[PDB]
Design a protein around this ligand. Structure first.
Ligand code: IPT
Ligand code: IPT
Ligand code: IPT
Ligand code: IPT
Ligand code: MG
Ligand code: NA
Ligand code: NA
Ligand code: NA
Ligand code: NA
Ligand code: NA
Ligand code: NA
Lengths: 409, 204
């Protein structure tokens, strides 16, 4: 517990940019795009206010648009007098992918008609389309093969405080080891994480801070409308914060909280607010109505584990169940606890042979061991129970491909 | 119940079946079979023939049966076993786990075939387990797959009975003969014998 993330003070003009959303759509073969930026303001509306959104490739301004506030008509009552949407055309855009993370810079300026700046906001923009079509997850029209890993925010000395250095170290090691994707298990991460993913190039699964694993049954809270409000803010506030990062390609409703109606409602909210990214969620058997991707944890390649209500079918078999058409990407597989990963190749061989098997996220990146010191001040790695904590789950906190200090297993 | 249509020897295999000039003769082989057998409850599926590639004629005939007798699925293996002329993925000799990506007409692993993007039909092999001589090696692998996968709904082994013919020796003793044994040539020698049972029905 504690204040484990940054604390800062931000000064804004009273008349300010209160929100902005950036979207990129394309033609059939991606040789054309249109960037649409919706901007909202707070403060006093004045006919002389303007917003200019300009897009830059390095030092060059490739497009720009300016307009007064006043959005189009929405309904019988009119439109948003406090918002405006600028549309910029971009020919032959340089596309973003984890292979080549090409980025542009979008600058949103709130100013007066005569040219005086009031304030400016901005973001890195990656021109990329994420869509599922004909049962396959496509990025810029090509089917992905997710070489993923789940990564918790963990430091052996600092606990849950994350720093730029550790994050870069993790990213470099991931890329160096052929991963192209990461799942935020199981909560939104420190903001810098996304910036690094955007720039170094990793696909990201951004995940709501919702997990009720210990309930009996698991969806006891998630199926209860009284808990809809709280869950809702864990989902909606995440989208509002991260929707402009191109490295985020899939949203996740959370983890291990069974399948309850609250999840269906929140699945729908996201679908409606941000159609540009699939929504996934494994609870309740990994193929419910609240998921666009069959995303099981630990389903085996060939062996079925027909548990009641929430069976874990062989992945090969799962894809072809009667009426099933979605892609399958395991949200967790190849549990790397201790001397492990036996059978790894078996998954890769299947992924390469079946088009709809599009990979998975290994569990997991780094051992959550913590440092303790002996009587001579020499440090040692500790696990559950070593702090007098009880009950505890002993070594189950250590399942990484790398030791806590980033040395590889 | 299968129409008497097989053009295996043409090059490409669909040379006649894609030819409207052959539609009339083909058409009767299908229509007259339906007219004759439509009242037999044992007939559960109609088949357009065998190894005749996939041609337009197959498509017209498939539709004709769907119209005249909606009570039975229509299947046909030619041109790739999953064409628009068949309600069932019905490959011949596709293996269980191993893909055979022949160009134009690949024989994918049966487990993988079911799940190719957009595929929805059941898979029942029209021929598998070629029981030629000392054979049937790997039969179990199919059964295990059939039991595990709802959409893998079995298959038809190739085949029932050796097509050997009796000949008589100098002292008039009978012996089993195969291709070439009648002076016939060219011929395909023992390929005519692929059954689970000997011609006299004694089992292999
Ligand atoms: C990035 C744009 C040029 S895509 C453009 O959008 C049009 C609608 O605006 C039509 O759908 C065109 O067919 C499509 O190519
Ligand atoms: C131990 C199982 C019954 S639950 C299992 O525990 C794992 C421990 O690393 C992970 O937390 C998995 O997500 C969880 O399903
Ligand atoms: C002839 C082989 C390379 S096919 C290979 O066999 C494997 C078993 O070793 C797996 O089951 C794969 O699905 C299959 O592609
Ligand atoms: C031998 C192959 C090139 S053709 C192969 O021959 C078999 C011979 O018993 C059967 O007739 C099969 O139906 C046919 O596809
Ligand atoms: Mg810095
Ligand atoms: Na695949
Ligand atoms: Na314990
Ligand atoms: Na764990
Ligand atoms: Na079956
Ligand atoms: Na010969
Ligand atoms: Na034969």
């Amino acid at each position: 517990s504690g204040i484990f993330r940054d604390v800062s003070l931000l000064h804004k003009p009273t008349t300010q940019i209160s929100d902005f959303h950036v979207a990129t759509r394309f033609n059939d073969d991606f040789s054309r795009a249109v960037l649409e930026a919706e901007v909202q303001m707070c403060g006093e509306l004045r006919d002389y206010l303007r917003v200019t959104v300009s897009l830059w490739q390095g030092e060059t301004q490739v497009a720009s648009g300016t307009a007064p506030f006043g959005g189009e008509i929405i309904d019988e009552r009119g439109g948003y007098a406090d918002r405006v949407t600028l549309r910029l055309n971009v020919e032959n855009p340089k596309l973003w992918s984890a292979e080549i993370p090409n980025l542009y810079r979008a600058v949103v300026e709130l100013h007066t008609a005569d040219g005086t700046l009031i304030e400016a906001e901005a973001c890195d923009v990656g021109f990329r389309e994420v869509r599922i079509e004909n049962g396959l997850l496509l990025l810029n029209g090509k089917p992905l093969l997710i070489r993923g890993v789940n990564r918790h925010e963990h430091h052996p000395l600092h606990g849950q405080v994350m720093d730029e250095q550790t994050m870069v170290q993790d990213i470099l090691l991931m890329k160096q080891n052929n991963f192209n994707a990461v799942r935020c298990s199981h909560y939104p991460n420190h903001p810098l994480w996304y910036t690094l993913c955007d720039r170094y190039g990793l696909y990201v699964v951004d995940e709501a801070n919702i997990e009720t694993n210990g309930m009996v049954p698991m969806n006891r809270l998630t199926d209860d409308p009284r808990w809809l409000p709280a869950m809702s803010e864990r989902v909606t506030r995440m989208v509002q914060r991260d929707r402009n990062h191109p490295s985020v390609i899939i949203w996740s409703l959370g983890n291990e909280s069974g399948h309850g109606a609250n999840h269906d409602a929140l699945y729908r909210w996201i679908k409606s607010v941000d159609p540009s990214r699939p929504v996934q969620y494994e609870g309740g058997g990994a193929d419910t109505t609240a998921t666009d991707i069959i995303c099981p944890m630990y389903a085996r390649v060939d062996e079925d584990q027909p548990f009641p209500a929430v069976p874990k079918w062989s992945i090969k078999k799962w894809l072809s169940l009667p009426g099933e058409t979605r892609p399958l990407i395991l949200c967790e597989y190849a549990h790397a606890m201790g001397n492990s990963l036996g059978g790894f190749a078996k998954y890769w061989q299947a992924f390469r042979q079946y088009p709809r098997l599009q990979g998975g996220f290994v569990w997991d990146w780094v051992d959550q061991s913590l440092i303790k010191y002996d009587e001579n001040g020499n440090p040692w790695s500790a696990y559950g129970g070593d702090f007098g904590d009880t009950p505890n789950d002993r070594q189950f906190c250590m399942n990484g491909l790398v030791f806590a200090d980033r040395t590889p297993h």
